[PDB]
Amino acid sequence: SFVKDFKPQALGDTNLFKPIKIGNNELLHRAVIPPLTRMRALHPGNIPNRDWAVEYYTQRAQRPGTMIITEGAFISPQAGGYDNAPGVWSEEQMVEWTKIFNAIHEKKSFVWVQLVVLGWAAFPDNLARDGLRYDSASDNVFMDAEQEAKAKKANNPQHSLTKDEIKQYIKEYVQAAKNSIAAGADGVEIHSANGYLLNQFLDPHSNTRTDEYGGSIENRARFTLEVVDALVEAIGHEKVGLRLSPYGVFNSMSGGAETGIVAQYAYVAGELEKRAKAGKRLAFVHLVEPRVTNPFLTEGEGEYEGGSNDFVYSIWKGPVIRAGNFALHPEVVREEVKDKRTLIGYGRFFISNPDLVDRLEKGLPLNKYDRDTFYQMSAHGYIDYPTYEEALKLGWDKK
Amino acid sequence: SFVKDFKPQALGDTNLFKPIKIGNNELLHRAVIPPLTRMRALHPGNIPNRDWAVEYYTQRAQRPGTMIITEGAFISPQAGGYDNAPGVWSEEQMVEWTKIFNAIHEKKSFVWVQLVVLGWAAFPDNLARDGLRYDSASDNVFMDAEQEAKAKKANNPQHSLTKDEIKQYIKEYVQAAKNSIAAGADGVEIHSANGYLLNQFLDPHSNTRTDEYGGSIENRARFTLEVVDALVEAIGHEKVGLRLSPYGVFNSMSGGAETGIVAQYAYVAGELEKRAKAGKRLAFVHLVEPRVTNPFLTEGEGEYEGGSNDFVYSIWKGPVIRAGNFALHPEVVREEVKDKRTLIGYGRFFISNPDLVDRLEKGLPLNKYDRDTFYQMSAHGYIDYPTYEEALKLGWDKK
Ligand SMILES: Cc1cc2nc3c(=O)[nH]c(=O)nc-3n(C[C@H](O)[C@H](O)[C@H](O)COP(=O)(O)O)c2cc1C
Ligand SMILES: Cc1cc2nc3c(=O)[nH]c(=O)nc-3n(C[C@H](O)[C@H](O)[C@H](O)COP(=O)(O)O)c2cc1C
Ligand SMILES: C=C(C)c1ccc(C)c(O)c1
Ligand SMILES: C=C(C)c1ccc(C)c(O)c1
Ligand SMILES: [Cl-]
Ligand SMILES: [Cl-]
Ligand SMILES: [Mg+2]
Ligand SMILES: [Mg+2]
Ligand SMILES: [Mg+2]
Ligand SMILES: [Mg+2]
Ligand code: NA
Ligand code: NA
Ligand code: NA
Ligand code: NA
Ligand code: NA
Ligand code: NA
Ligand code: NA
Ligand code: NA
């Protein structure tokens, strides 16, 4: 069905429908697919779904000139811990990714691989089964009681990374980025948001370290910036973006309750601008808005009203992708895209609307999403959401 | 004469004319007199002007319930270096300040003493004459070539403060604050703006130190925060405010060209909010806007368009006074005061309009200021600017 109470607005007369260049890619509009974990990868080996993933991405690439950021992809076994999320370290994985990237490019769209390391969000029992550590910044603060207990039961207590282990992750980020480009991706996004490992280093709640990787703003940002620099060197700044969620609380990050949180993120933005002014500007910065501090709460819930991401624009002077509850709020998008370097990521409603871009241009009703099939091993709720035309044929204008 | 091309707007229907409490003071409107050095203090002894200062402040206190921040006042001889700016360390000074504060209070207005330490902005020859150091954060970066040369000629080369000397300044801030309150002031403002000593520590251009007072965001903010804490302890948080100019370039500060500048100031704001949440909220934060990066350039010049102070509001949750080119821009004020904790400082046009508040309420023409008498040893251009009524009698509606 269509979302019942929604009053759509046509956005074709806004900058959402003006072309923009991101990295090497000439986008034809500014509606971006943000990274969306869907849990259709198959075990063993974290293999992108051999039956359905090409179709899923093909459907969502259908509007020419769309920027797609993939579902999060693990850079190595140690970086993972969810059996049904994909990786980008193995030949068997890259065979499937190549097909996905080719399909997106055949639709004249673009694809950026999000590179993920889970840290404390991983399942410690899966890691133990596979002979892997349960990693985070620290060893004395935990995501929640259940995770702490699972780790202990698995004889895999949370481990504070050594400097050498940080370096090993950096090597894996580099190789994952190389694999992504060699397989045909247009670029990569470094996931430093949503309470995953790099965010666990950025945040003073999760990072109680007293070495050079914690205990100050500069130290907490060190790992993220080392990954940025290593990837810029390996594949070029034009093929690298960075995702941040300053106000996020998902995965036990601090959000606005931490009075130093804006400074922490302002520092990162400043360091990116410094690199840019020195000739190595990242393709984009991608921000999760305080509109959505936890993406598993219904739109409108978990909104933080005490802060804005606008500060980033005073510091970083490149493209900015903003995501969080924008599909149901075209009136907000209309204002935000007046800024000529702003793009809008649409997550949950891209799950349910493969032709979302047409719907945004033309002010059409939106398909309701089905949260129960966000994570499921099924084509249902993955590749069977209809286009607007298909929905009309199903009678959804009258349901 | 009145400013020729100005189209006034009545602001009586805005929050500029709603009461607000700042510290212990019930303000009746939100037009604030920011600190304005006028150079009428007499030498020797940096004595507030015995002939005219009471009249100057009485005139500008005339609208009941006005918050006045004094001209910058030196906390000690070593903190000074301008012969015609006043101090607040001596009995002879405080005799005159007491008369000023009493006069302001008789007009049912309020007075906050701005506490100043000049650092590298001081005149090294005046300091040498008096047996005093020429101080800054560092000893290897200078305000400008002329200052560096004057210091060398005076056998008083710029000196990087020792930790003990920093502590001595802190003692002097404490005593200056105590003197101010004992003489009848409502509170004090710590000057950490406009390229004076505390700002010289905040800014990475002027602060090349490698001890705990430089080399990182936290270290560069240490001195300012130590002054804040020492004054809160001495006289109470309700009697203390802090002035900052994130985007200022006056006195050779970095401004927006420094990509880390927003992070530096965000850190300070965060530390103030942390103290507030722990029960010690400063009375206000006072910000100079990027509208005026140098207050000795005509309105409209030296405007930095690449940054906003709005970030501070995501972090600090108390009152904010904003200053910089607001008199000629009532349309901007009308928007800014929609925020219910925003006050507006009017500097140069309070020099020339003793009844500025009435003029703002009622949308009246403004007296043109005379920059030549901003700093002069004269009643002319100090206490002889007319009220609106007096200007009409002079025929200024027809000049
Ligand atoms: C099912 C689901 C999976 C997600 N997976 C990822 C992910 O892999 N990487 C990431 O950075 N964010 C992920 N997110 C967060 C989204 O990218 C997005 O920031 C968020 O859903 C808010 O945007 P929206 O309101 O348009 O959905 C996910 C969100 C959902 C609901
Ligand atoms: C003559 C003059 C003297 C000033 N003296 C001080 C001072 O003692 N302390 C301070 O913090 N700012 C001082 N300022 C800066 C003003 O407080 C204010 O921030 C600036 O003039 C911008 O506001 P305006 O455009 O309303 O004048 C001075 C400015 C002028 C023009
Ligand atoms: C499992 C992954 C990669 C994941 C899922 C959800 C979110 C919000 C995220 O940031 C990452
Ligand atoms: C001499 C003093 C106290 C002074 C003068 C002008 C400005 C802008 C300032 O910040 C301070
Ligand atoms: Cl799993
Ligand atoms: Cl002088
Ligand atoms: Mg242990
Ligand atoms: Mg169902
Ligand atoms: Mg020396
Ligand atoms: Mg003259
Ligand atoms: Na419409
Ligand atoms: Na099938
Ligand atoms: Na802005
Ligand atoms: Na789950
Ligand atoms: Na008017
Ligand atoms: Na006289
Ligand atoms: Na705001
Ligand atoms: Na001068």
Closest atom, ligand 3, to C-alpha of A116: 3
Helical (H) or strand (E) element with A114: strand A110-116
Helical (H) or strand (E) element with A383: none
Within 13 Å and on the Cβ side, how many CA atoms surround B307? 28
| CA–CA dist B195, B120 (Å, integer) | 8
- What is each CA distance from A299 to A292, A296, B386, in whole angstroms? 7, 9, 58
| CA–CA dist B323, B67 (Å, integer) | 14
| CA–CA dist B151, B125 (Å, integer) | 7
What tokens does B126 get?
């005046």
Maximum Cα–Cα distance for chain B, whole Å? Answer: 62
Beta carbon of A195 within 6 Å of any ligand 1 atom: no
A303 Cβ contact partners less than 8 Å away, ≥ 6 residues apart: A290, A291, A292, A293, A325
Residue B59 counted as an annotated binding residue: no
Which chain B residues have any C-beta within 8 angstroms of a chain A C-beta?
216-218, 256, 259-263, 266-267, 269-271, 273-274, 277, 306-308, 310-311, 314-315, 317
| CA–CA dist A119, A260 (Å, integer) | 22
Contacts of A307 in chain B (CB under 8 A): 314-315
Beta carbon of A23 within 6 Å of any ligand 1 atom: no
What tokens does A238 get?
């034009």
For residue A48, what is the DSSP state? P
Q: In one letter, which amino acid is B287? A: L
CA angle B389, B326, B241 (to 5 degrees): 105
| From B217, B259, B269, residue closest to A315, measured CB to CB | B259
CB B255 within 8 A of CB B208: no
A36 Cβ contact partners less than 8 Å away, ≥ 6 residues apart: A71, A347, A348, A350, A351
What tokens does B245 get?
């100019």
Q: In one letter, which amino acid is B248? A: G
Catalytic status, residue A196: yes
Domains of chain A as residue ranges with CATH = 1-399 (3.20.20.70)
What tokens does B292 get?
């005026």
- Residue of A82, A173, A196, A385 marked active site: A196
Phi and psi at B322, nearest 5°, equal -115, 135
Which among B314, B316, B339, B341 is the top mutation candidate for probing chain A, defined by the most A β-carbons within 10 Å of its own β-carbon? B314
For residue A154, what is the DSSP state? T
Cα dihedral A334/A338/A344/A349 (nearest 10): 10
| CA–CA dist A109, B235 (Å, integer) | 64
Instruction: Report the SS3 class of residue B316.
Output: coil
Q: Which residues pair with A344 in a beta bridge?
A: A31, A322
What tokens does A41 get?
């990868």
Q: Where are the alpha helices (DSSP H) in chain B?
A: 53-60, 91-106, 124-129, 145-153, 163-182, 197-202, 217-235, 261-277, 311-315, 330-336, 348-352, 356-362, 388-393
Does the bond joining A44 to the residue before it have cis omega, within 30 degrees of 0?
Answer: yes
Method by which the model was determined: X-ray
- CA proximity to A25, closest of A287, A231, A350, A283: A283
Provide Rg for chain B, Cα atoms: 20
CB contact (8 A) between residue B262 and residue A259: no
| CA–CA dist B224, B220 (Å, integer) | 8
Residue showing tokens 């992108």: A48
Residue nearest to atom 8 of ligand 4 (CA): B194
Between strands A110-116 and A187-191, the pairing is parallel
What tokens does A89 get?
């370290």
| CA–CA dist B25, B78 (Å, integer) | 32
CB A114 within 8 A of CB A243: yes
What tokens does B256 get?
């927006």
What tokens does A10 get?
């046509």
CB A30 within 8 A of CB A15: yes
CB A2 within 8 A of CB A315: no
What tokens does A384 get?
């069977």
Q: What is the resolution of this structure in A?
A: 1.3
Q: Which residues of B are catalytic?
A: 196
**Nearest residue of chain A to residue B290 (CA atoms):** A314
For residue A4, what is the DSSP state? S
CB A338 within 8 A of CB A16: no
| CA–CA dist B16, B334 (Å, integer) | 8
| CA–CA dist B1, A205 (Å, integer) | 60
Instruction: Report the SS3 class of residue B229.
Output: helix
Q: What is the DSSP string of B9-33?
A: ---TTSGGGS-EEETTEEESSSEEB
Phi and psi at A78, nearest 5°, equal -65, -25
Q: Which residues pair with B287 in a beta bridge?
A: B244, B322
- What is each CA distance from A354 to A398, B81, B127, B388, in whole angstroms? 20, 70, 73, 66
Instruction: Report the SS3 class of residue A40.
Output: coil
CB A90 within 8 A of CB A42: no
What tokens does A94 get?
């890259």
CA angle A43, A44, A46 (to 5 degrees): 65
Ligand 9 centroid to Cα of residue B366, in Å, is 49
**Nearest residue of chain A to residue B314 (CA atoms):** A307
A330 Cβ contact partners less than 8 Å away, ≥ 6 residues apart: A8, A9, A11, A360, A363
Residue A348 counted as an annotated binding residue: yes
Phi and psi at B366, nearest 5°, equal -110, 140
CB B104 within 8 A of CB B61: yes
CA angle B151, B154, B160 (to 5 degrees): 40
| CA–CA dist B357, B369 (Å, integer) | 16
- CA proximity to B285, closest of B258, B254, B311, B257: B311
CA angle A244, A125, A293 (to 5 degrees): 25
Residue B341, classified by CB atoms within 10 Å of its CB into exposed (0-12), middle (13-18) or buried (19+), is middle
Q: What is the DSSP string of A243-298?
A: EE-TT--TTT--GGGSTTHHHHHHHHHHHHHHHHHTT---SEEEEE-TT-S-TTSP
A41 Cβ contact partners less than 8 Å away, ≥ 6 residues apart: A47, A48, A49, A53, A83, A84, A85, A86, A87
Q: Which residues pair with B42 in a beta bridge?
A: B47
Residue A332, classified by CB atoms within 10 Å of its CB into exposed (0-12), middle (13-18) or buried (19+), is middle
Q: In one letter, which amino acid is B322? A: R
Ligand 18 centroid to Cα of residue B82, in Å, is 9
| CA–CA dist B257, B304 (Å, integer) | 10
For residue B334, the tally of other CB atoms under 10 A from its CB is 15
For residue B248, what is the DSSP state? -
What tokens does A334 get?
């209309």
Between strands B25-27 and A73-74, the pairing is unpaired
- What is each CA distance from B256 to A303, B27, B253, B326, B395, in whole angstroms? 31, 33, 10, 21, 45
Q: In one letter, which amino acid is A393? A: K
| CA–CA dist A265, B89 (Å, integer) | 41
Q: What is the DSSP string of B150-211?
A: HHHHTT---EEPPHHHHHHHHHHHHHHHHHHHHTT-SEEEEE--TTSHHHHHH-TTT----S
- CA proximity to B281, closest of B338, B333, B319, B324: B319
CB A251 within 8 A of CB A196: yes
| CA–CA dist B269, A215 (Å, integer) | 19
CB contact (8 A) between residue A270 and residue B260: yes
Ligand 9 centroid to Cα of residue B40, in Å, is 34
For residue B215, what is the DSSP state? S
Residue A134 counted as an annotated binding residue: no
- CA proximity to A286, closest of A259, A268, A300: A268
Which letter, b or e, does each residue of A71-90 get, where b requires 16 or more Cβ atoms within 10 Å of its Cβ? bbbbbbbbbbbbbbbbbbbe
CA angle A236, A241, A245 (to 5 degrees): 155
Between strands A110-116 and A135-136, the pairing is unpaired
CA angle B242, B245, B248 (to 5 degrees): 160
- What is each CA distance from B55 to A7, B59, B62, B350, in whole angstroms? 62, 6, 11, 14
